[PDB]
Amino acid sequence: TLRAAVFDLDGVLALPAVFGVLGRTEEALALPRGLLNDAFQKGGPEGATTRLMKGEITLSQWIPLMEENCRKCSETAKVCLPKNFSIKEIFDKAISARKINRPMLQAALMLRKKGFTTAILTNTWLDDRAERDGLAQLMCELKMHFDFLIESCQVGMVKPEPQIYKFLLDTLKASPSEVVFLDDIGANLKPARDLGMVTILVQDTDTALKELEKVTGIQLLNTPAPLPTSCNPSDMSHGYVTVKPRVRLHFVELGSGPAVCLCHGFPESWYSWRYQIPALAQAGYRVLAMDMKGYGESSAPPEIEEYCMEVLCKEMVTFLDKLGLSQAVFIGHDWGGMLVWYMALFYPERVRAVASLNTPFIPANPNMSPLESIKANPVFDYQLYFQEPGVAEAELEQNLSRTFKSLFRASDESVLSMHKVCEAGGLFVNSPEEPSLSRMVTEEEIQFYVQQFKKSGFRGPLNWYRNMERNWKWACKSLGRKILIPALMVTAEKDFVLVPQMSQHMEDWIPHLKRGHIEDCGHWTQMDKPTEVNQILIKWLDSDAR
Amino acid sequence: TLRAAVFDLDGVLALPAVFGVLGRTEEALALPRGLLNDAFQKGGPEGATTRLMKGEITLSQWIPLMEENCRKCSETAKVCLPKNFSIKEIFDKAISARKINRPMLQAALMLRKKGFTTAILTNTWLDDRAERDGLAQLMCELKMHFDFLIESCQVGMVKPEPQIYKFLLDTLKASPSEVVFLDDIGANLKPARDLGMVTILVQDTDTALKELEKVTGIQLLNTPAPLPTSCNPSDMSHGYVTVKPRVRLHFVELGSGPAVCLCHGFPESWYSWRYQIPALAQAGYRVLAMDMKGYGESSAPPEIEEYCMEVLCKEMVTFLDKLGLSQAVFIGHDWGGMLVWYMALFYPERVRAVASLNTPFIPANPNMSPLESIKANPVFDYQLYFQEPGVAEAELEQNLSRTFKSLFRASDESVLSMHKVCEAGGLFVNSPEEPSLSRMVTEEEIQFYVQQFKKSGFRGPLNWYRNMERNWKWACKSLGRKILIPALMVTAEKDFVLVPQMSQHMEDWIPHLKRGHIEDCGHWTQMDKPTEVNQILIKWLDSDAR
């Protein structure tokens, strides 16, 4: 029956409410109880506050008017206002004190996820204070999670006026009895209740959620901890830069602040960073998530040398050049992890900080050809399988669905052993035609990859593996150097290819290296343990890159 | 005969040279003359400095080694190093003290513009100091103006080693006698001279330019003041954001720092901001230069209401939302100028600062229908001509070349009077089939516009003019408000449509408004007086938006 949930901001999605700082100030300053609410509501329907809420005047025009009301209120109750009494002060303070009420937002998210149309309906103001950016930020973080945001000041109406509820109903394309409406102010429920909406008086969040959980029959409180926000591809800003004639790079871009460049592994996509993208934007960064050369919407020229580390690096430099960026933070996974270490090593003036998931920094052995180094280790046998142009392309392109559903699996879910892949004749010889979905990925998300690899297949991506000798010679040039810019290394307990112990000597080349470690996490780090990854990168960026 | 010019960075394109801070420090600290050069060059071909220049070690690894050399040099000349002697200090200081030598860069630019292949060839280091960003910035600003940058540390060779000159020759695809090579160090000329290159010992810049001007027979010194850097479209990062199902917005993006959103007028393009784009990036900003709805690579849906101010504004808000930006600086010209004022007025939490070229902020007259307001003023008669869908589309699309060559003209160049356009039957009735090129635009630049308007023509752009009544009703909602966020207004002496006196009352609605004024500048402000515009915006951004 119920199909939509409507939330207020002040006192429901963000706490503490500002009306509440009207109370605390009163106590704080031993003013007459209510004096500040009295001043705030003066003249009711025709007073300053209503005009403000209706968009007739801006916050900064309003401040002086509330001063006047406070001056008149204090005169009628025969009390003096304290030397230095500042409405601007009180409100600046109140406004930044208010935060997203995490449980409420999560309840809204849940309900959205089980089918509800959700909305913010709020009495608010046109904010033009010097410190307005605060609220702009909050409102951005909130609005993305809702189907609608309806603001008193944008529509010229306010609660409890019966018409805003009609506008509400109209925007929802629902009928009053399919709506739950939550508010902290009883007056604003009355018109919702009159049309026959379920209404929740929100005092403590938890009890409001109990009523909400009861009346929608969905579990909301005590639910498991949810995944970080994902990206909807077609809601992203997509960016494109030609770095030389036959080669353009695609990326997705979110947030402002220090530029942070995310480099995915083999055989993946910008989409591999879907869980990090909003978190780091949210954390105060300009995330640039790449399609690395050879993938998705980036160019994929056929030649093998187009993919040696050197060419790949100069190309990332040029990407900075044309975007007008003097440095970026480089963060990489797997193959992208190898690339960023090498970026630190040949272009440190352009790297603000460097960080890798799974991929250790290992130097070239000037004594031992890299092909040989690779045969010494059974788990790397698949890298040999990848040498012959055509062979791996054929097997991996033959069924895309199957490929990604076979590769993208948690530690406890595997279907392909990396064991003697050459001998077996393939990566999937001993694995299913129709593998089950990994707990880590939806059907939809598999298709996204599928559709990306339909543009260029696997020739480009596989090439990255086919300059073993060329990268070795180049790598040797850096053997005298050390990495001395900020550097994070994140090991995954259960990557059985890029194992933690492989990273163990890294401190010799990177004396000041920082570490994070993720337990119970296989190879596909970002999607396997998205929460822990975000926690580790944001902490390190805030401390080493800012 | 001469076809290429090669420049060094230290002491030729950037001054003061760092080797020179080795001298000044000596004097400054009353050390033995040369002691610091001695330490710097210790061991020659096999000493620390050569290894550094060759890319064998990074700057931070080198610092301690030069300390050692300085300690050993001071011991052999039997003198003590001053308590607190710091090579890191000296170099941090020296490195940020060095600036682009504007006249040299201009000479290089000129020579490039008359056909030369130009290059930076320099002995430099892999810089990994905490303050490396300085040099990264300098190198970005310089490298864009050259065909090549060849760095000792990237190629493993150094001047005066004869092979770097062979690599040079090879990269130029020129022969030694078509090359002028300028350096401040005589030793590094000797191998250039040996192969038979013209060489210039650069002591004072001016005399070096005289030799350079003499030997290439091009004027370099005393030349007129050049235009700001333009954009090459295909060297830009192009960005694309879907703001709702049938509507995506294109933009071009350059630089980092506060986001600054440029909004072009009618009938123009992001390309209209080609002179501002590098300057503001250079000035420390993230320039986002739009194709406004209806233009170039942005969507151009046919319906008229798709272009009322309201829809246009909510759409720019959404553009911020999806790019993850809480505010941007809004800067507008002409129609884009109208839009930004309205953005300040309905969404000030999202506008960090507002600024318009030519377009005053004028309120709606609640007493007088806007059509009527428009007939009261003869110069606005063309806005009436634009009302009838089809009429203006036909005339403007009939010959694109002709259109833009007729519209884009300096104050002293005009061909169309705006006078009684309706009566005449068109905008071009009394103007040429083949107009001459305006001094403001190259043939190439006209074509760029031409090709842009081939995607959608003029239906979209013209619509902006076709919601007079709708924008009026909406505008009236803001009549109680004032603009109190930072605000710049820039009048063009010789815009005979958007005349300076039209802006004269703006202080009533915008008490703290700031002004700039450009003399001898017609309607096409950005391209007519690009230098003065950049000077005015950068000064105001630095002071009001940062």
Ligand SMILES: CC(C)(C)OC(=O)N[C@H]1CNc2ccccc2C1
């Ligand atoms: C290049 C380095 C040595 C850094 O790691 C990798 O080979 N990565 C992964 C890529 N996913 C994947 C997929 C199939 C088989 C093996 C792998 C190993």
Ligand SMILES: CC(C)(C)OC(=O)N[C@H]1CNc2ccccc2C1
């Ligand atoms: C919309 C406002 C009132 C702000 O200004 C304009 O009509 N701009 C210009 C556009 N260029 C142009 C081109 C042809 C004719 C008239 C004009 C006037």
Ligand SMILES: [Mg+2]
């Ligand atoms: Mg409330």
Ligand SMILES: [Mg+2]
């Ligand atoms: Mg020199």
